[PDB]
C-alpha cells in the first residue's frame, strides 16, 4: 500500500485521480472528471489504514471530494469508501455516496449511491 | 414476528404501510404515501426470515414497491431492507434503495439511498 497507492488511478469512465499516500495515513491529491480540461480538477483528501498483512487482505481507505473549484460549484460532495489491492493488477474497489445540499423538504433525494473500480491502466 | 409484523405501520413522514406476514415467509400488503388519498396506494411484496431467537435479535425482512398504480407511474421502484423488533414499542428499522429507470448515460444518478423507521403509532 502507501507507495503502492501513490500514483494515478483511472476508473471505467475516464475520470482520473492522482494521490500521494503519506507515511501516517494521509491521502492527498486531485480528482479530474472526463474531458480532462485544465479544471474539471478538484481537491481530494482522505485516509487509509495501514497494517494493513499475512493473508492478502486489501488496505481500507476513503476520501472526499467537494465539487467546487474556480469554474464550478456543484453544491455537493462525494465520499468513496473501499480497499486497495496491490499486485500485477492492483485496483481500488469502492462504493460512493454523493450528497447534494437540499432544503429540508428535499432531503430524501439528497444522496445517490454507486460504485467505482480504479486501475493503474 | 409474523403476527407481530402483521398490521399497520407508520414512518416519520406519515407514509403508512399495511402488511400480512404469512406462515411461510411471505409479506404482502400496500404502501400509501402522504395525503392519504384513495390512491397514493401501491402494492408491496417481500419476505421475512423467521427463526428468527433466544437472545433478542430482530427479524430480518425486506419488501419492494414499484411506483405504478392507476393514477401514477413514477418509473421507479424502492426496496427496504431491515429488521423487525417487537415489544412495548415494536418498530422496523430499514435502509432503502430507490432506483429510477434511466438511459445508460444517466445510470450514475439512478439510485438514491436513505433510511426509515416504522412504528405502530
Amino acid at each position: 500500500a502507501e507507495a503502492g497507492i501513490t500514483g494515478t488511478w483511472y476508473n471505467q469512465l475516464g475520470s482520473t485521480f492522482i494521490v500521494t499516500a503519506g507515511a501516517d495515513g494521509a491521502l492527498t491529491g486531485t480528482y479530474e472528471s472526463a474531458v480532462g480540461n485544465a479544471e474539471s480538477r478538484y481537491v481530494l483528501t482522505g485516509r487509509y489504514d495501514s497494517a494493513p498483512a499475512t493473508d492478502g487482505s486489501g488496505t481500507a481507505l476513503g476520501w472526499t471530494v467537494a465539487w467546487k473549484n474556480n469554474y464550478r460549484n456543484a453544491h455537493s460532495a462525494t465520499t468513496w469508501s473501499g480497499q486497495y489491492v496491490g499486485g500485477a493488477e492492483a485496483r481500488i474497489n469502492t462504493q460512493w455516496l454523493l450528497t447534494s445540499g437540499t432544503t429540508e423538504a428535499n432531503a430524501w433525494k439528497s444522496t445517490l449511491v454507486g460504485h467505482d473500480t480504479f486501475t493503474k491502466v | 414476528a409474523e403476527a407481530g409484523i402483521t398490521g399497520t405501520w407508520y414512518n416519520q413522514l406519515g407514509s403508512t404501510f399495511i402488511v400480512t406476514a404469512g406462515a411461510d415467509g411471505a409479506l404482502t400488503g400496500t404502501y400509501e404515501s402522504a395525503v392519504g388519498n384513495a390512491e397514493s396506494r401501491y402494492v408491496l411484496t417481500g419476505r421475512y426470515d423467521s427463526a428468527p431467537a433466544t437472545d433478542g435479535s430482530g427479524t430480518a425482512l425486506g419488501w419492494t414497491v414499484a411506483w405504478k398504480n392507476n393514477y401514477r407511474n413514477a418509473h421507479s421502484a424502492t426496496t427496504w431492507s431491515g429488521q423487525y423488533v417487537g415489544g412495548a414499542e415494536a418498530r422496523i428499522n430499514t435502509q432503502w434503495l430507490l432506483t429510477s429507470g434511466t438511459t445508460e448515460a444517466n445510470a450514475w444518478k439512478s439510485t438514491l439511498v436513505g433510511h426509515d423507521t416504522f412504528t405502530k403509532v
Binding site: 469512465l13 472528471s33 474539471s40 478538484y42 465539487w67 464550478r72 456543484a74 454523493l98 | 450514475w108 444518478k109
Partner: peptide, 6 residues
C-alpha cells in the same frame, strides 16, 4: 451532468 462524471 455533474462534475463527478463530466
Amino acid at each position: 451532468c455533474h462534475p463527478q462524471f463530466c
